[model samples]
Target: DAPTVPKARSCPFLPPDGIADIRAAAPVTRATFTSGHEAWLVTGYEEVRALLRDSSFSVQVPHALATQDGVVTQKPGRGSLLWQDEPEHTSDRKLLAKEFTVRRMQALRPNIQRIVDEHLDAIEARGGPVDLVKTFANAVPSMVISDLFGVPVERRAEFQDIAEAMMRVDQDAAATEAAGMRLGGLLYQLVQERRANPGDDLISALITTEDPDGVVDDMFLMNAAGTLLIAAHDTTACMIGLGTALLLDSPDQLALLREDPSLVGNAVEELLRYLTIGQFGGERVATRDVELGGVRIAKGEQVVAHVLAADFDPAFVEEPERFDITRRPAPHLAFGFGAHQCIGQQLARIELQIVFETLFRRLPGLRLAKPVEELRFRHDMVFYGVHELPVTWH
Candidate 1:
């Protein structure tokens, strides 16, 4: 049997034990993915960072995302940012560059706070034992991203169904294309509507924004918005669910956070690093002969930077296994790295910080409805998260 991306995490909070084995043996180790493709599994923190930043390695779909059926491939439509290399990518990324900067994202802080509060308030009124995953955790980011993209309030539920359909890993080509068309047609309508009457949203901005490179068009904008909507929704929601579960499980961390809420910012970083929700890490194909971790990766070979190993690498993080919320924010690859790293990351960061701080502060008695052992983690899904986080507060 070929070595695969290790699943079956021993603990919900830690990486699979096999990850350490890969890094301990070598920085770049030969491995085979379940997709049946042989690739270099890059685990060393330094090497992983270098590989992500390396221009020579292009974001190719080969063996990147593994679904049980096979590898998930991106068609690299005109606006899709992940699969494109430089020249095309550099220009394409610029379209959203100014929008997601640190300063720009921070400006939405007041808005994000209200968004978090309303969800928590709704939860309070509804009363627990509510499944945070189903309602609060998932809904918060869904709504936040909706506002950012200017999806009509009434139409969000429709958009949510479409988003869910697009995310399902097991589906026939016909079903997949049908979902895509639904996504495109609806989003194109938003573009047309926004063009007629602009609003305080990205879709409006995106439609009017200059495409200096002329690489962007209606199709590109639609695809780009679709990318942002799908990308931002689940990842941030997963963090909120998993992060809350972790804090609930660890009273010491919870106490520290409550005692000094100033730690919330750093606490969010710790949570992101600890969870490393996307366990599979960044995937790329070597564009040319490049030496990595003493191994010569030939052109066209696949490489994956295992984020869990890199984040937990002793060289990179001191006492890595110890979940200290006050570790001064190390350079964890949780949001990924380099150009293709998550563009909406700051948005995610702010959302998480607000969610963690507000959720605990508002409901001081918040806790797990059942023992941690009974909770379900999302190993089978594309991202690692709690399937359902049942909690109650007085």
Candidate 2:
């Protein structure tokens, strides 16, 4: 018999198969990625949270992959915040966090509102049988991120295409790397442009910010901007698309949200908790011998904290399988936790809140154009969402 591994999710809300059994048996269990790597998979909520907060665990790339260029590192050093640890992560993250603060995000609400309205106008002009994924979900975040980066309006669509290609997990490694290189090259040029002619954009802010220790360099800025572009658009786009499907599928919950405008914030939290789209979990290597959830983990072994499984763990929430938007203050690992939690989470929260409220309010009769089962979910992608959400308004 084949060894048990966490199965890919077929449904939006359902936790992966084998996860429940593994969590029930032990929070941390051995599993393998497609690369044939032996790693610890943490499924329990407590365990996932603990591991995320543990500084002993490092988030560096597991190993370099062999390419025609010999050995190529998976991510950029110092620039890619996700793959960094320690003082480097702290300094870079501090600089970026100030730009994404709650007050700063609130200040950007008017621009975000405008972006949403413009996309809705486009969607309306195109008429029914529209793929919401393209017209609404994907476009909004892409436009917002492009504007933030000061990308030319004419070039924003191209930027979105490049970002999408770079993020596609289904693509071959070589093709994906090529897309990434293209994005990185474009960002490098953008960084130089921003330096020459700084504007009131995020990239410009990074360029002009006073760095006492010369921590921010040209390569770091390029990679930082590239990482931001990729991170800002895709996950939120998926959330918008996936969250819409869930609300449409659950009419009662939808009506509840429609009845109470106040529930919009809570509903977003619930949807985030229920979806928990980061199925792949956080990757780390144990820095020292440690005991986690009654299991021993040795140094130099890869550890993966399963976000979806932890979100569905019985110990975390009552009726982990049920979708309840009214569940206030829903605690889940959607944005991850600790020092490396998603930097753009506040922005994502506001974007989701406005989109969900406005979508349901404007199109009270919105319904899925295709059956639920007919809709294809992106199982192969790093983030999970519907490939195309066909919907109609009557």
Candidate 3:
């Protein structure tokens, strides 16, 4: 049978119907993408995790450029750690990993709490029927990221606007490119300022690193900062926005958490696993002839693991589709797996835990202003989330 990329998801909480078809055939199967390139689509939990962990598979810039829409633009990797493989990737990741360690994230907890509280104050001041995305969901992460990156309070709005334009996968190519340029210019200027006047922030720490081999070039720092700016907010924003809707849909789950705040920690992990918002799985190219999930991927072939499907795979957990907050912690691929896993995951977890707990605690009667079916989902973007979440407190 001719292979095809799975269809866009009809429901945010579930995988696209085509993913079911792919999974039924085999965990890993040859699938053709819209770009007209044939690549391996890994759907099963074990297969997806295995492929990601395997060093035999490589994630290099050239391979990604070639497979993307069949357009061969000689674009730089844009300082995205996601685009780099070993050694270089390792060095880059090491420079920033310390800043995102659990201790660092915990230290930022009180500040995150404050950020969430400020947004909640605004929501309360404005009254109910507030757009959660604008007032709370997006605001919390955006502001928190600004604080972490040492983005000036005055320029956070500008930073947020540029970051949104660049991270939004649904935007036009030209607009995305333009936003990238604007953000690059802004970060370049900021990096220079940081160099001259180091402060108590991540950027300052990065610019003043003692490692002689560490990147200190303006462009490198700009790219690195820009990458964090994009990743820091988008995913968590979606989780907060979408997770609320999901919880509202299942009042029992929301109610359970309201009764026991301790559940918030486990709930965050479950939501991450259940949503698994990564639109495309990790992309890798085979360096050597390798067998994955019974399929032989020859050297140089492309592979994309369907993260949503893998997260829903029954092998990992019973009743994968069921949203159970009480479920014991199980390994899920929402953050991806292996060498290139999300560097900011600890920060994301801290943010989600604080925001969700605070939002519900402050407004126990919070309910959706719009019906579940009426809410529009961001199917076009690489991230799956509601464009806006309208909620009202009784």
Candidate 4:
């Protein structure tokens, strides 16, 4: 018999396989597990997208016979919104969505642009050859999210540190767990503070908002806020750096974007599709026996839907493999599909769209300070980044 191959990739967010493995897998092929673990990988465009919305697959917890005595151990806050199926997921999401509406996002544009410009000003003041990821990309979004919640200046820096530590999971699991514990402690503290002194920020609003059961709890706020900052901050930072790298690689595309700032939104979508920033977007536990794509997925099985695979599938996208800015109807599953889609997406879009517009417009002659091959890209880590982006303005 052929040596047993793992059903789905483990630590799919890390490198050696995180980026390249998905590329090589193409339209994924299946292999059975000898360990008696029934796992499935949803690859291809239509299937992955469909799996994202499938109600039969629950993220709550697997109700089946298992080697483990309880629910699968997952990253901190993983169960909040990312893993939820619906109804409850929908309600939880709706409670938050009331604040993340399109009108709400549009109102933040001017504020976001100011935030972007301030960061750019600091970068320029520091002279040439600064880490764009640190100076502009990461800092802007982190501060903006803090500003959104009206976080105090004294405590705001801690938010950045905790977010960084928390997001460092892929670097070292043990360290990541430690960071989560530390962050949870901090979150617990903040929720206590918020309860005593209410504010007009989202966290306060969320905590004070009522259900038939009265106000939401500290645990919910702790999980929701921490998750929101990490997801909103790093993902946009990666997009800015990765998108810039892609644009730098293609002069024609760069020129096209430079010629018209209107296309920033479309370009943002394209880059999200291409990069698939969140390598492994949690997982789904099977509810009942179901057939997916030609394979029999058992009731107790766990399945992973690779967003990268779906975005790159040629069936849904025109020449999905190629990075074309002009790709029409570029309905990519970057933020994800269905009710579980990113709630902070509109805010993220506003930040990214503004950042791109300002960077190219303010620094038109901006190019990589060093050769592309010479730069170090973060693949071993969960979040993607170009460690040092040394660029000079004309």
Candidate 5:
């Protein structure tokens, strides 16, 4: 038995004790998986960044993933984003990155702010105790992205359920498969619609965008749009819920943010660093013999860069555990590092800054409906966040 990926957090604000213990002992340690695969776990800040940007390592993992049954790797649905590691990843990233620029995303800020306020109105109407995860956090992001992608509002209810079900990394494989099939089918239909008649959304832009490599096609559109559908909303929703909870837990920080609007941007980055919530820590496999953190990781060896631990690495910052909104935002690998870092990060930051500032300002009395200890954090979910955040402004 080896370290089980540190699923259970002993505290809301900090990473698991397992991560702390391992990081304290040494940065790189032997990690044995359920499938009997022994991998290297890189926990230190420097080690993680080095491992991430190391050309010797890669996103393409031949044997990293496993279950009790056996090793299973599915076809990447044809977008070279996550599974492929070469010219394809770069070519594909270029296609999307052109559209996700800071200026373009910033242009959408007022629209995002409008959506935040619109949803806040609903929260106030629903009144007294409400599940922020359901009514506000999840709902707002889902609608905003749905609008961005031109997905009709009527279809979002069903899409939301499918998106949630599809995202569970721990769910039965069959269920995940079923959800993906349905999701791809829905996205495929939209691809055809956009093909026949273009629109202002991202999907239509991809359709008409210059593809010198001759890569844009039906399968590419479906897979790429599907990936954005899941990624754009799901991960952001988790941050909204968990970030709210963190701010509530740290009232003084919230006050600093509330008293001064400019602190909102800094507050979001600090939350990103503090919560670095992506659960798997950006798993990878060494493509060649690489010595990292004083350990020689041989070719084909699976290596996990524990960003959650790396964010808290003492070497990263002084008093790494302290939650300070005014503190300079550490260049933490919260979004990620290297070529594969999320292009949508700008859009995410814009949405989050708007949400936190507007939500707190509009509802000054907002507080948790139950004690923090009583709240259920979703250690089991794909992204680290609370399952539900019950809150009341009145």
Candidate 6:
């Protein structure tokens, strides 16, 4: 099976100006893949939604369908519970479910809001010609997650750098693997320290979770703490930077949003649909032969869910191309759907809402520091994002 090539090696999301020709060529065409992986791209909204929740498509078997020719084996064990299907997925979800109550997410609002204000202060302090993505947008999510763990502010510089390197989409095989090892080792060491000297942080609480029996082991504690930080931290941070840039490019939407703070929540969902990060849902390897969208998928084949295509499906959205902030809260595959949906979604929502509110209020005239043509959107990666976003204000 030959992999389909994407439109180009440039920005996959909101494809750069040249892709209008592509939409003209094949608006809902099969994604171009170089991995030689035979997989279906669900460009229609309803089908993508159905596929994500469909019990027939399982994540438990990575070799079943999605990664047959992928460069990387997309499974959940390395970090979060995203790859597990049920039972173990169900059981693992239960262990740390306590950290994510609606109350707990709402409780973080004040602190998140404070972080937004402080970052905005720095943005203002930097005066004109600021990189909002680096200065304001990127800084917020990491700080929010750090505040959640009660990690000292001083430590974030080091760990945040490690996280950025680890999450880079374009790293060579050796460099990428080494970055991941460093991140994992740091997490392992952090958990060990928490166990020896417990404190009020989330890691400490996880380390000391006990019963009538005794303390939890290092492996178990690290799993709960490490996955939460990575999952809850990176995507949300990337969205903040990208989302701001997305909205700024569309002046009308930004004006409408500024006029009505109440519309921000719905606006965020629309932005999620517009931007639709988490590009490919957790990869799935087919356990048995399955027929989908009139195509036959053989046993043990790999399938990657083209989430961006699905979110823009015309069946699910009236005019999927337009950016309408008030569009009815269309269910999107942004956080995925069903049992495997992102558990940290609520916290993510809080971070985005607070960040947007604070950004507009604090930085009254926030705009891109450079022209859109000059910005560098990341080209080679399963997950799509910008390499750099240059922005500015008076």
Which has the greatest lDDT? 1
Off by more than 4 A, model 4: 1-28, 31-38, 60-79, 85-88, 168-178
What stretches of model 6 exceed 4 Å from their correct place? 1-6, 9-32, 60-69, 73-79, 169-175, 196-200, 208-216, 289-298
Candidate 2 RMSD to the real structure:
3.0
Alpha-carbon local distance difference test for all models: 0.82, 0.80, 0.80, 0.68, 0.80, 0.67
* TM accuracy, model 3: 0.92
Report the lDDT of model 1 for residue 303: 87
Which pairs clash (backbone N, Cα, C closer than 3 Å) in model 1? none
Off by over 4 Å in 3: 8-10, 61-68, 72-79, 165-174
Q: Quick one: RMSD of model 1?
A: 2.2
Where is model 5 more than 4 Å wrong at Cα? 1-7, 34-36, 64-73, 152-175
Distance from true location, Cα of 31 in model 5, Å: 1.8
Write one digit per residue (lDDT tens) for candidate 5, span 94-207: 887766457767877888988899889988987879999887777777667666777776877776676666655556868778888887877788789888888887788888
- Positional deviation of 243 in candidate 4, in angstroms? 1.3
Order the numbered candidates by TM-score, best leading.
1, 3, 5, 2, 6, 4
Per-residue lDDT, model 5, residue 315, is 88
- Ten-residue region with minimum lDDT total, candidate 1: 61-70
Q: lDDT tens digits, residues 1-394, model 4?
A: 2222322333322222343344345344443333344456566777777777777888765521122333355644322666555765667667666654667667778878888898888877777777787677777787777766667878867977876666543456678778878877877787787787987667776776655543256666776777777678778888887777777777887788877667788887887887787654436767888777766777867776767666766677766656666656477788887667777787887888898889988886888888877777775444556766778777
Looking at candidate 6, the ten consecutive residues that score lowest on lDDT are 19-28
Per-model TM values vs. the true structure: 0.93, 0.92, 0.92, 0.83, 0.92, 0.85
- What's the CA error at residue 336 for candidate 1, in Å? 1.2
Where does the lowest 10-residue lDDT sum fall in candidate 2? 63-72
Write candidate 1's Cα lDDT for 263-342 as tens digits: 99999999988988888878888879999988999998888888878998999988888889978998899988988888
Q: Given candidate 3, what's the lDDT at residue 186?
A: 81
Task: Report the lDDT tens digits of candidate 6 across residue range 137-218.
Answer: 5577777777766667787787777767766665688998898778778788777766678766666755544423332456
Better of 5 and 6 by TM-score: 5
